[model samples]
Target chain A: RMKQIEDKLEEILSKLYHXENEXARIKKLLX
Target chain B: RMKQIEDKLEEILSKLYHXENEXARIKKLLX
Candidate 1:
């Protein structure tokens, strides 16, 4: 229950960080 | 334009990070 919830949060945090870098990379290529 | 595009992406990234932190805090309080 709560265990999986925390895991998901951690997973989501990593995705957000990845997205930030990906976002910057795309912008750099495009702009 | 480049102005709003970067601004929006940056703004969205900030919000995603903020949401991540806020999620952890709430889980800490709840669980």
Candidate 2:
């Protein structure tokens, strides 16, 4: 499901790749 | 947060996507 896809993206950001720009990345994808 | 205990539960239940028994128990716990 796309929710899982969204979650994997979130996991990538939360676990390995958080940075100043990461939140925007999440927001853009979620939107 | 296991990073996702609740989120995964949502991915499964609100979708009503599975009949997993533990899934129902967990949905009740989300509140």
Candidate 3:
């Protein structure tokens, strides 16, 4: 079950942004 | 508070693939 469309999209954004930030941070450290 | 599902999905800023592309670019830099 899910909260609703708003919640679902926001949730997706949370994870996608979350994971993307991890990669970005790693890149930042590397460079 | 929002639009229809079809419109909403893409409206999310089509970032899912866009973000994934960022990761692929980083890997490219590493290799």
Candidate 4:
């Protein structure tokens, strides 16, 4: 159960990080 | 060419929205 929580925490961190990259790409696209 | 631009714009919008949801989930995790 603790491991599952840790996995989900890590996953969300990665998703958030990737989306930050995605936003940068989007800005480049718009420009 | 204009339509391609529009499609990409929409795609980026959707990704941003999805990322917003992910952020909310992350907040929940931290809490």
Best by TM-score: 3
lDDT of 4: 0.61
**What tens digits encode model 1's per-residue C-alpha lDDT throughout B1-31?**
4554555457556868765765555565555
Model 3's CAPRI class?
acceptable
Model 1 chain A TM-score equals: 0.55
Cα error of candidate 4 at position A28, Å: 29
Q: What is the lDDT of every predicted structure here?
A: 0.60, 0.48, 0.70, 0.61
Lowest lDDT 10-residue stretch of candidate 2 chain B: B14-23
Candidate 1: TM-score? Answer: 0.41
lDDT digits (tens) for residues A1-31 of candidate 3: 2338776887777777786688769878775
Candidate 3 chain B lowest-lDDT run of ten? B1-10
Evaluation by lDDT, superior candidate among 1 and 4: 4
At residue A10, what lDDT does model 3 achieve? 76
Q: Distance from true position, residue B19, model 1, in Å?
A: 11
Model 1 over residues A1-31: C-alpha lDDT tens digits?
A: 4556555555756777775576557545543
**Candidate 3 global lDDT:** 0.70
lDDT of 3 at B18: 73
Q: Is candidate 2 or candidate 4 better by lDDT?
A: 4
Name the 10 consecutive residues with the lowest summed lDDT in model 1 chain B: B1-10
For each candidate, report its DockQ versus the true two-chain complex.
0.05, 0.02, 0.35, 0.05
> TM-scores of the models, in the given order?
0.41, 0.25, 0.60, 0.46
